[PDB]
Amino acid sequence: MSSRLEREAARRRTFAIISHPDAGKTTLTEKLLLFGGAIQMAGSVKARVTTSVMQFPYRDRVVNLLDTPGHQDFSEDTYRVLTAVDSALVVIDAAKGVEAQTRKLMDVCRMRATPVMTFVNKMDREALHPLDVMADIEQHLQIECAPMTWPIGMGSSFKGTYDLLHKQLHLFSQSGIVIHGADDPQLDEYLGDQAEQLRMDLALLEEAGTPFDEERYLKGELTPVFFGSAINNFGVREMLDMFVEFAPGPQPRPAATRVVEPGEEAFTGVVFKIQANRMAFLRICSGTFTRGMRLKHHRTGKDVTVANATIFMAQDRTGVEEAFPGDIIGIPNHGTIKIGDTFTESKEVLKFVGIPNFAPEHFRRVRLKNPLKAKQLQKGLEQLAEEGAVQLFRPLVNNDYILGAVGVLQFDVIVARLADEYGVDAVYEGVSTHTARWVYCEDKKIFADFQDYHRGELAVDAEGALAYLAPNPWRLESAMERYPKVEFRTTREIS
């Protein structure tokens, strides 16, 4: 029945953690790696390409945890990682609830209907009450919460958790203690006065809580919520068990001509990011990757050998070097590549769709220190935008170069690269813009009118796409009203 390819692909669980800085991602990542027996990798993560992709075995699943750069390293590449996973894990600091970056990263997951599980971290310190945390998750992540584990107390009074389906009490300071219904005197023996509160909460959950439903989880409509304390490696086992059991394996991926299924024998993969020193990171969409093989780079029309590929793999497995759907590989190259590029082993022309550019929130105008360098600046900005390092907008009404960054670090990298690779010394000037949307209107007449009236706010980006630049989302909301026929989108397909 199942081929070797389909058996391997079915074992993969490829995901990333979405969280706001200081929620606990690094700490939880270290503990996950320890369950995976990935001792060295955990030591590496705790000490801070090697860590962009961490693969580890757990309960015979091959888990691929892709890093989502955060803090000062937050960039459009963080959102690009989310286009390569089949599911995500949300980590929240229980004292803060859903925070700004949690929401923006969930907005990306939502466009892709990516399933998400949720870990509420730091229950060992005073926290939002669990009913309030659940309401906050639903309100800001726009998803139903299905509690899987439920905390008893918080902070100094945090006794541990009760696992609703496994009927197990997990004590905080280790095997769960099996509990036999709400009346089990084991609850009073282990929880003391807090047993009454667990009983009240369980009664409330029975009446008003949402059960886990795998189909709703897989559609992105419901998230299983776990509570714990990653620093104590507590509650993490239950969440990981649930993740390997229920999180989706490699999913079909749309291409312009058809949907590609992971069980197709012929290799296909898509580039979702590029690291400059260059390495292109490819998600394997179907088929089997082997070092030996030849791949067709359909954009350039060239054949590419991959004898120098990086196969990210666990310290653990030993056999012949191959990689399967859901896995990530890195292909070194001398600058040939765009985000979204498709590689195939067959001659079938395939073009994966659905890796977009994302609307930037930070904008700067570029100024040259030396006017004689104008052609080099145009070359460098165009090549850096084609490569995905920044977005570039050219306003209809002037000749300015306006750069759009998802993360501010990007502006520093562009200046560095302009200097080093183009011999161009550029500085930034501030602009009013904080918002871009790509505009579209299937009515040719109304659109010409829009483009005439709002000519001062329109720009064309490096892909040729028309965009409305606004000082902020509220000023934007006002142009939308004047033209209820024009669509304003927060993403656009790369070509």
Ligand X SMILES: Nc1nc2c(ncn2[C@@H]2O[C@H](COP(=O)(O)OP(=O)(O)O)[C@@H](O)[C@H]2O)c(=O)[nH]1
Among 96, 125, 365, 379, binds ligand X (CB under 6 A): 125
Closer to ligand X by CB, 227 or 343: give it: 227
Among 6, 8, 86, 124, binds ligand X (CB under 6 A): 124
Annotated binding residue at 14?
no
Annotated binding residue at 122?
yes
Among 9, 16, 18, 23, binds ligand X (CB under 6 A): 23
Among 13, 18, 19, 273, binds ligand X (CB under 6 A): 19
Among 12, 25, 31, 253, binds ligand X (CB under 6 A): 25
Q: How far is the CB of 233 from ligand X (least distance, A)?
A: 9
Question: What backbone torsions phi and psi does residue 481 show, to the nearest 5 degrees?
Answer: -65, -35
Is 160 a binding residue for ligand X by CB under 6 A? The answer is: no
Tell me the window of 44-52, 77-85, 117-125, 143-151 that interacts with ligand X (CB under 6 A).
117-125
Among 14, 52, 68, 121, binds ligand X (CB under 6 A): 121
Output Rg (C-alpha) for the chain, integer angstroms. 25
Annotated binding residue at 121?
yes
Q: How far is the CB of 29 from ligand X (least distance, A)?
A: 7
Among 92, 117, 191, 230, binds ligand X (CB under 6 A): 230
Among 231, 293, 304, 431, binds ligand X (CB under 6 A): 231
Contact map string, positions 394 to 413, toward ligand X, x by CB under 6 A: --------------------
Q: How far is the CB of 376 from ligand X (least distance, A)?
A: 38
Is 27 a binding residue for ligand X by CB under 6 A? The answer is: yes
Is 236 a binding residue for ligand X by CB under 6 A? The answer is: no
Annotated binding residue at 220?
no
Q: How far is the CB of 38 from ligand X (least distance, A)?
A: 17
- Rounded CA separation 249/355 (Å): 19
Annotated binding residue at 24?
yes
Closer to ligand X by CB, 17 or 255: give it: 17
Closer to ligand X by CB, 27 or 435: give it: 27
Annotated binding residue at 233?
no
Instruction: Report how far apart the first and last C-alpha atoms of the chain are (Å, whole number).
Output: 38
Is 99 a binding residue for ligand X by CB under 6 A? The answer is: no
| Count of residues near ligand X by CB under 6 A | 15
Closer to ligand X by CB, 151 or 326: give it: 151
Q: Which is nearest to 15 in space by CA: 351, 328, 344, 406? A: 328
Is 117 a binding residue for ligand X by CB under 6 A? The answer is: no
Could you give the C-alpha distances from 105 to 45, 102, 108, 466, in angstroms and in order? Answer: 22, 5, 5, 25
Is 153 a binding residue for ligand X by CB under 6 A? The answer is: no
Annotated binding residue at 375?
no
Is 24 a binding residue for ligand X by CB under 6 A? The answer is: yes
Is 78 a binding residue for ligand X by CB under 6 A? The answer is: no
Annotated binding residue at 176?
no
Closer to ligand X by CB, 26 or 64: give it: 26
Asked whether 232 and 121 are in contact (CB, 8 A), the reply is no
State the residue for tokens 């196969």: 311
- Rounded CA separation 84/328 (Å): 9
Binding positions for ligand X, rule: CB under 6 A: 19, 21-27, 121-122, 124-125, 229-231
Annotated binding site for GTP: 19-26, 67-71, 121-124
